């Protein structure tokens, strides 16, 4: 609240300093921001405690940055950490005390939890509460009465208005409890699903699963893990532990196929007990319990084919022990979020690898599913070797003079097609691909503009893939990339970042970017995180190049796009010039070729 | 350096400056490697010796040391060819110099220099001294232009501020001597005191200025005896740099926070720590003020916390490269005053004018293909006179 002569807020008169400040490695700002030391001997204990009570926002190598909020404190209470149980240790760890503001915030957030519980039974959602005064003073606003369908006091609530009531309670200061007591539940018989000994659970996976199962009752929340870290395995383990009917929701055909494959590989459950509620193919969804389907189908708003209507009615009628949702970052979308209310589930677990978006709808996930239970430390995984180390780099390509002339002259938005296609970046990508090809490194080129992708691919006679590409040709190209030594590069379009199971690649060049999309950046980066059989963290075998054009809007987009990665800790090294480019022969070495490319770009319209 | 300062002097001032007590020893210590040995050798000789002996008195290997030492001491005029006997005065003084004839102080020096830097920066609370203010103003690192309003800080001021304490103080004292000659204070008398430290009205005023700078402290209500501080004769880091342009500095003295804020955006200030961000805005603000990326990088490196000393390099490459690129972008457009030519009837005349401009140094850039060139306004008069002369 107090501002120094500079921008930083003043806290000299706010909180004191502990005498043994050197011993205490923890800081506590009044706003809730906490700065932990990664060099302290008790760093591991401090990390565990701060991860338990707070969500990371920036975890560089030296000083980690966390911030706590109501959702994080509710998650702490869910895993069973009381207000004293957290605040006493927070004061002990803190080297400068705990401000009264944070003290009262923690007390209020902890006490305002568990008073209101939401439990669905016999397809009816009852708002139970041991304390009756909570309901007595909660029925002040008319929205509760209109929403409601027309000790231990409970009342039934309308299915459709659950989301509205939950978001209302969040700001009403009485969070709802979504814990599932699968251990004590006889209404829905347990499913015959077990985890085979073959599956191996990594320490971070086990920690995330523990945070989810803080107690005997499973907690509904979101666990963010890298795509290469085995989030599919974590979800399968969660379903197996729940031992009740599980509905996994993918985002595409590839996602559902991969989910079925993961289920069969890691769970002893028989093949016949798994169904694919997919329009392309179905396996008698009503027949078995464990189901894999898609948001588009479940939230489909237009006409429903009679068979799918029967399946949808069956799904609505039945109650699901677990609702796994992969790629939760798309949930807050209108149709996708409608699925949450369409289907009934005790706990709706969420898994993803890029929980970031521009529109401020990510906060809605906290109530749509639950608090962010776990968020894996990418740097720690890199050190442990579970994830391939990546030498993140941004190659600056100076824009050609004529191209810059037209780009600046035109105030329209042909610049997206223009600066994405310039001779300098073309030569840079050509030279980089040549260097990695002679180095036997697998290349996955990326480009949002299909026009630019096709032009580059024809000029380099490479197998570009994109949306309306035939599925058979897509599979053939991927198989050739994985097996044929003569080819070691594939030019994938935006479809690549959506969802795929692609072979591990040693480099990932991105000539063009869709825009300031942290989601796309992280999605494309996750491709090369696949750990090799015998690599090492320090070898930096994996490389990521984000080619950008100097003095162009692409620079702003790249800087706005690398925020999530830098927050994780990746250091994007800038490359102004590439050694050997002048000696190496490359296309567009003369003014004329740039002229024809510019003419084609202009005629593109 | 002191070697530069002494080299930039005349023989008449040099021999006088070679006072008996200390100068002959302070200048001796300057002798880097070998000239010490020759000075000791021909300290006891009253007969000059041929130059060929000195030439051949060093082996073939490492002769460049011989030539450089001989040139340096010829510039110092310790001896004369006399045809290489040393100066009689220097010989006598050196023979007389060779068998012939605190914890609170360092803190005081630190505090005094810190308050001086606080005044140098726009600190509302700082020590007030009109003589110090005017001395800094005339030192070339500050300009007021309005006695009523407090003086501001010039471009050189920020560069001086970001320098390390040793070099900062040394340059400050160099400027002090140069301005002492201008104000009329005898240079030799004040200079000899500095040499004597490492072992009149003008003397009293000079000692007062030194005490104001914090190098000395009488401690006895300005008595004749003085106890020089450590700085008179001539530390761990605290900043931690992340990979996201974030600085965590364990600073309690406001001077360090101000120095960091000069080129970073401050976010939080804890009792024993402060958080700042190195953004384009702050870095380009410093560059426009006059700093260059080299000073910022050196400052962060010297004030480097021990935690980041283990990693090599100490400062992350991404941070260093980003700072350098930010400074470069500002000077992408290089402005240079000049005068253009047009309508060259014949290329022979243009080439002759180009040769003349190259000889005189007037030319700044030329274009043979377009038959044109650019000349600075200073050389515009010369080239115009040449054209008039035809």
């Amino acid at each position: 609240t107090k501002v120094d002569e500079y921008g930083a807020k003043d806290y000299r008169l706010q909180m004191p300093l502990k005498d043994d400040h050197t011993s205490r490695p923890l800081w506590v700002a009044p706003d809730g921001h906490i700065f932990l030391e990664a060099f302290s001997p008790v760093y591991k204990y401090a990390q565990d405690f701060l991860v338990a009570i707070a969500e990371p926002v920036c975890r560089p190598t030296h000083v980690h940055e966390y911030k706590l909020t109501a959702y994080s404190l509710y998650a702490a209470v869910s895993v069973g950490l009381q207000t004293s149980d957290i605040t006493e240790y927070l004061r002990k760890l803190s080297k400068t005390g705990v401000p009264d503001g944070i003290m009262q915030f923690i007390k209020l957030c902890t006490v305002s939890y568990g008073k209101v519980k939401l439990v669905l039974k016999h397809n009816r959602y009852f708002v139970e509460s041991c304390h009756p005064d909570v309901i007595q003073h909660l029925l002040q606003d008319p929205v509760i009465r209109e929403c409601r369908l027309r000790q231990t006091v409970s009342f039934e609530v309308k299915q459709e208005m659950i989301e509205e009531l939950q978001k209302r309670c969040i700001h009403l200061e009485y969070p709802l409890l979504a814990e599932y007591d699968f251990r004590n539940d006889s209404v829905n018989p347990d499913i015959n699903i077990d985890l085979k000994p073959t599956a191996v659970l990594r320490p971070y996976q086990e920690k995330s699963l523990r945070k989810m199962f803080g107690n005997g009752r499973a907690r509904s929340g979101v666990i963010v893990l890298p795509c290469g870290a085995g989030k599919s395995l974590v979800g399968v383990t969660a379903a197996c532990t729940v031992r009740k009917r599980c509905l996994v929701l993918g985002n595409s055909a590839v996602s559902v196929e991969q989910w079925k494959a993961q289920f069969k590989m890691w769970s002893t459950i028989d093949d016949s007990q798994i169904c694919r509620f997919t329009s392309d193919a179905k396996d008698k969804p009503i027949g078995c319990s464990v189901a894999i389907s898609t948001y588009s189908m479940l939230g489909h708003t237009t006409k429903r084919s009679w068979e799918a209507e029967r399946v949808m009615e069956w799904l609505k009628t039945q109650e699901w022990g677990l609702m796994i949702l992969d790629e939760v970052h798309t949930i807050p979308a209108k149709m996708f979020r409608r699925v949450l209310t369409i289907v009934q589930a005790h706990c709706k677990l969420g898994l993803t690898a890029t929980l970031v978006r521009e529109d401020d709808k990510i906060v809605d996930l906290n109530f749509l599913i639950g608090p962010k239970l776990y968020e894996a430390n990418w740097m720690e995984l890199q050190n442990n070797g579970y994830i391939a180390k990546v030498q993140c780099a941004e190659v600056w390509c100076p824009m050609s003079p004529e191209f810059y002339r037209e780009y600046v002259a035109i105030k329209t938005k042909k610049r997206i097609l223009l600066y994405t296609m310039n001779p300098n970046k073309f030569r840079a990508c050509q030279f980089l691909i040549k260097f990695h090809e002679r180095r036997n490194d697998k290349i996955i080129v990326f480009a949002d503009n299909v026009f630019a992708l096709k032009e580059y691919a024809i000029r380099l006679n490479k197998p570009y893939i994109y949306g309306p590409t035939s599925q058979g040709e897509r599979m053939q190209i991927l198989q050739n990339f994985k097996h044929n030594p003569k080819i070691n590069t594939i030019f994938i379009s935006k479809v690549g970042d959506t969802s795929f199971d692609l072979p591990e690649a040693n480099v990932l060049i991105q000539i063009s970017s869709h825009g300031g999309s942290r989601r796309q950046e992280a999605q494309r980066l996750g491709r090369v995180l696949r750990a090799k059989k015998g690599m090492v963290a320090e070898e930096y075998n994996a490389f990521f190049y984000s080619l950008v054009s100097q003095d162009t809007q692409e620079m702003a987009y790249s800087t706005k796009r690398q925020r999530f990665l830098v927050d994780q800790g990746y250091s994007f090294k800038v490359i102004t010039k590439l050694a050997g480019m002048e000696e190496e022969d490359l296309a567009f070495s003369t003014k004329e070729e740039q002229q024809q490319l510019l003419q084609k770009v202009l005629a593109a319209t | 350096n002191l070697q530069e300062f002494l080299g930039g002097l005349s023989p008449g001032v040099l021999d006088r400056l070679y006072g008996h007590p200390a100068t002959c020893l302070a200048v001796f210590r300057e002798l880097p490697s070998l000239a010490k040995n020759w000075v000791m050798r021909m300290l006891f000789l009253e007969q000059p010796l041929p130059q060929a002996a000195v030439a051949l008195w060093v082996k073939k290997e490492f002769s460049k040391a011989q030539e450089e030492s001989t040139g340096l001491l010829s510039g110092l005029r310790i001896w004369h060819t006399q045809l290489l006997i040393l100066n009689p005065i220097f010989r006598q003084n050196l023979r007389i110099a060779l068998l012939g004839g605190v914890p609170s102080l360092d803190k005081y020096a630190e505090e005094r220099w810190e308050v001086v830097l606080h005044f140098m920066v726009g600190s509302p609370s700082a020590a007030v001294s009109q003589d110090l203010a005017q001395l800094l103003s005339q030192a070339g690192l500050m300009k007021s232009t309005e006695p009523g309003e407090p003086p501001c800080i010039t471009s050189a001021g920020f560069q001086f501020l970001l320098l390390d304490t040793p070099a900062q103080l040394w340059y400050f004292m160099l400027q002090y001597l140069q301005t002492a000659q201008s104000r009329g204070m005898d240079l030799v008398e004040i200079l000899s005191f500095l040499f004597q430290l490492s072992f009149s009205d003008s003397l009293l005023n000079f000692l007062q200025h030194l005490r104001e700078f914090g190098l000395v402290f009488q401690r006895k209500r300005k008595s004749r005896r003085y106890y020089p501080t450590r700085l008179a004769i001539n530390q761990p880091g605290f900043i931690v740099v992340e990979t996201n342009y974030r600085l965590y500095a364990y600073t309690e003295s406001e001077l360090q926070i101000a120095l960091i804020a000069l080129f970073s955006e401050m976010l939080y200030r804890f009792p024993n720590m402060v958080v700042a961000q190195v953004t384009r805005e702050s870095v380009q603000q410093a560059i426009a003020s006059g700093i260059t990326a080299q000073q910022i990088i050196h400052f962060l490196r010297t004030r480097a916390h021990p935690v980041m000393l283990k990693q090599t390099p100490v400062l992350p490459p991404t941070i260093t490269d980003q700072i350098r690129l930010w400074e470069l972008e500002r000077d992408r457009l290089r402005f240079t005053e000049g005068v253009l030519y047009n309508q060259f009837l014949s290329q022979v005349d243009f080439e002759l004018l180009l040769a003349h401009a190259r000889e005189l140094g007037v030319l700044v850039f030329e274009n043979s293909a377009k038959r044109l060139m650019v000349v600075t306004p200073a050389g515009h008069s010369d080239v115009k006179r040449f054209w008039k002369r035809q």
Partner: peptide, 15 residues
């Protein structure tokens, strides 16, 4: 063998 490229091993900025 399998050594990192020059432009990633060392800064390519002119400084």
């Amino acid at each position: 063998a399998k050594e990192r490229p020059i432009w990633l091993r060392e800064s390519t900025v002119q400084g």
